[PDB]
Amino acid sequence: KTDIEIAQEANPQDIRDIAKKINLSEDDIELYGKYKAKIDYNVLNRTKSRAGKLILTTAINPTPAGEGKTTTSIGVADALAKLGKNVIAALREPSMGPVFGIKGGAAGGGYAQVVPMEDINLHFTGDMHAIGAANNLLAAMLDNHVYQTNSLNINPKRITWRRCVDMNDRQLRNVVDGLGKKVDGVTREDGFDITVASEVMAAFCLSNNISELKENLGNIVVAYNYSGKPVTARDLNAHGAMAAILKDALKPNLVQTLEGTPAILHGGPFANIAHGCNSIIATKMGMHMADYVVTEAGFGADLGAEKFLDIKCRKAGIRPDAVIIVATVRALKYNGGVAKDQLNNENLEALEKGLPNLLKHIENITQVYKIPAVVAINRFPLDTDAELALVRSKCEELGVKVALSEVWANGGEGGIEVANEVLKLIEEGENNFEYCYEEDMTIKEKLNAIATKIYGADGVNYTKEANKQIAELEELGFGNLPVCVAKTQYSLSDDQTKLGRPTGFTIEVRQANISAGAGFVVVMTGEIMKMPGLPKLPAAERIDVDENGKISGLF
Amino acid sequence: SHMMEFKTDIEIAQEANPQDIRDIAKKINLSEDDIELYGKYKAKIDYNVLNRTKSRAGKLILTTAINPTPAGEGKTTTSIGVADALAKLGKNVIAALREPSMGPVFGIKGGAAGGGYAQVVPMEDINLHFTGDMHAIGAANNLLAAMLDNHVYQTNSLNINPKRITWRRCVDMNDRQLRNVVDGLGKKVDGVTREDGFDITVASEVMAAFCLSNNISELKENLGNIVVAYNYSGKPVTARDLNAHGAMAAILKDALKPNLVQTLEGTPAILHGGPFANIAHGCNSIIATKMGMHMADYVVTEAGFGADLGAEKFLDIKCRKAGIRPDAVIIVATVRALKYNGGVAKDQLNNENLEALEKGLPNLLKHIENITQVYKIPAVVAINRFPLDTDAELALVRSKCEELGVKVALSEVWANGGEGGIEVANEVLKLIEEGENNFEYCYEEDMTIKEKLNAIATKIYGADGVNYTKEANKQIAELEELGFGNLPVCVAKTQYSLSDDQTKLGRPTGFTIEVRQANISAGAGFVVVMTGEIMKMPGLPKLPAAERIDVDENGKISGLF
Ligand SMILES: Nc1ncnc2c1ncn2[C@@H]1O[C@H](COP(=O)(O)OP(=O)(O)OP(=O)(O)O)[C@@H](O)[C@H]1O
Ligand SMILES: Nc1ncnc2c1ncn2[C@@H]1O[C@H](COP(=O)(O)OP(=O)(O)OP(=O)(O)O)[C@@H](O)[C@H]1O
Ligand SMILES: [K+]
Ligand SMILES: [K+]
């Protein structure tokens, strides 16, 4: 059975019945049909919390296919519901753009999904459109100020703010606008990002309430003046209207899994130029309404988990009680020199040389951040017991239990082995959580702390332009913020070919930007694509609608 | 006529007690299985209800007005007032109106759906994202542009000439910066360099085809007929050639369901669509008007601008493609507007001027002759009364209008609400039950483009002929050779006058309209004709209204209106 067939034959409950499972009245939610609803964030102010625990699901350095990190979160959440616990699965919302290029995807996979799958891949509750409308209003007010008076003395060559659209349109990567008559604006270079790559999205996810959201949108640096000083959205008096555009969008979206477990999908920025987690207000909503929250971070534990802990948790004042490290025997054998085609041969030798990658993420989670961790093995069909005994053998050496996950084929029943081990880590495991770095350090000291402790590098090298940018950010006062390293996800290093666990390498930083709205410094290692393109035969050509309004060709 | 205890539109809207939308749905025999809730005050009506219920064959009431003036007319408030009035009279009625775009909200100000005590609520949501119809229009518009540029970049096997790409992107913002752009810059993997531009989302042809589709099947067909470019041979390239109309209809699947809201008095109100009244027809969607006529006994809808533009496009475009016929027409006018057509300045409009009232009255009399003697529809003049309107002024309008065989009913819906439109509504009930309807189109399909433009300019506008530029004569002929000569025409001229001249007020006579360009909207199904330059993308003022909008610690928005 395909993922689209499992979702259709599933019987989803009325979302008002899902809300009763977390003690939410019908005056506390706003329906979007029978199967979707938004939760008023003011419930956080008139009801007391349940002080729920936080479960973070990460994974080893990924292969182009994946390791089932999202299916593991949904399956473990369903498993904890099978154990009688009150649980919410906090996940990200996909973007609509890639649906029309490489076709859509299920919120999860197999029997560990989130439903309705069709609305999630499309407009959902309109959160993407709200993000893009606030992004494009600030850009329209920025160009309007330069056209009317430019009393802020903005240099058009130094405008870093970019418009956005929820489409895979390579045509809009590099743009000249403001052409035509003198009443048609100020001519300058510009461009479009995909909406999820916008800084509005990152500040949307790193806001604890509506008051902090408006303050963060005001801190957004949109350009620089001719004197070199930053110009903020607050200087343009735009953050008040931007917060109004995002007023309803900031309300988390309540949905359900295939087994009726309450699910919350909210936000979803990049995991390279941003932190790649769901919104703070959705995570803290789950911890307010449930006893256990299963969330995740994009890419491997060297990026998403590092940014979940050093950026999201630092701004939310929260802390994970357990970490689930997802790993597959295919990915470890892929790290052991095996190609994608030969991933099915029982190669115990290549599994051992790809294991240091899994063991490195185990050391980062358990010894650097000091959080109890458990290795969840996403059992792909052809795994052998000798393969599963070797990965269980060397994970015992550093004091981490290994549970076998079968949530893709069995749903919640397949995650009981992982669920129980997480519940025991919350009871047993001591928690001495420490950040990878402190705020007082400079930008270069924070990057060196991440590169040596987490990545395993000897140090960080900076180009001539990066040194100029880092120093200018220090002079402007942005040296007290966290740093967001944008590098490849397929490797611990910045070289996407160095698989396994690289040894004597150094990170080369070539560009640094400021995301003062989200509250971190973006540090780029290579070139990052913020607007993907459409393939030769886009999937949109196969999408159709019948006489009753049923969509075909989406999945 | 005047509000005894004056309140702004916000104070009236927030002091109002709106019913649950499921209780509004019960007033039109719609169960909770037929509606998708968007909160407790907004809902979407499944369009497959018309395939499961017997139609009530409701009556259609079009609300129009004289030419727009700087003094105001009140065509939107009159629509809500008459609908609330019919509800007070025991009638099962629905008000069908347009949805505003979010763009002008951050420019100058946000406006109530109406005003005074003739409003539609929830006001805050309608002016903002509402149920997301505008976003789906823009998504489908920009998807077509993305696949158009992708095809040209990948193979260009359709032989599209990049200089001849008419399709533009859109955004629901007032951003003059995006009027004229050049994109596709950078490396070879960054597309094909060409000139481009952005329209405001309500100006997209997708929006025009969105309102002129009877069902989702016609929508997919209309979107496929959209002409996006021309090849080097001169032949049109359509969205169907790009295999895009199926995906565009999927983006517009939920959006095609009309939105169900309510007035201040609990009357069911359907808001769906809202394009321009110059480059398009300026009406709410056909499926919304069909929905009301299927579920109600009377439907009150409106058309943008004066009767020379919106009512003409309602009858010659929308009514033609929907197969419906208006039973009664409401011509809304104010005494101060007719005195403005008489030569009185905007600051002297409050003085009683009986002679200037008769000099500007030929404007109202011209629209009456168009509704009653050209389309042959029973009409009624609804005077939006103001406190300073003397009895001599009101008696002069009633005298001159009753010569054409049309009654004049006073309207006080702004200050009194539903009971301020009883006189107008009962005058409309008399026209439907008594007067005969020999509805005729202004022209027919078989005529050439220049014959349809001549029939409109002479019968409706009062012109002696139509003059064409050299550039217009070729474009008309190119559309004739390509087989677009059997489509209605949508004249894009000024709204402030019956001519193409903004300053000739009242009733100009010895003039001629001057066509300067002619485009094709094969998706909506009409040929666009222009007498001047059109602003498809407004700009922000020096101090935009967005600087005043704020949100508090609890999520309450202020400064919006
Ligand atoms: N044990 C399994 N057997 C077979 N297929 C699986 C298994 N686990 C996951 N998958 C498939 O892999 C796909 C992607 O999984 P998932 O998205 O959870 O991984 P991910 O790491 O979150 O992906 P990404 O990192 O690309 O976001 C799903 O569609 C699912 O069907
Ligand atoms: N009789 C009246 N007295 C005072 N104010 C009125 C009256 N009628 C209408 N208005 C005001 O005029 C404003 C606009 O009226 P309305 O929208 O009905 O006019 P319109 O020109 O037909 O529509 P639009 O203004 O949207 O183009 C409303 O805000 C309303 O408050
Ligand atoms: K989405
Ligand atoms: K709107």
Numbering used by the authors:
A (entry chain A): 4 to 558
B (entry chain C): -2 to 558
What does the publication say?
It catalyzes the synthesis of formyltetrahydrofolic acid from formic acid and tetrahydrofolic acid. Formyltetrahydrofolic acid is then converted through two reactions to 5,10-methylene tetrahydrofolic acid, a metabolite for biosynthesis of pyrimidines and amino acids.
Comparison of the structures of enzyme–substrate complexes PaFtfL-ATP and MtFtfL-folic acid showed that the FtfL binding sites of both substrates significantly overlapped with the “active site” described above, suggesting that BBR may inhibit FtfL activity by competing with ATP and tetrahydrofolic acid for binding to this site. Each protomer comprises its own solvent-exposed active site close to the protomer interface.
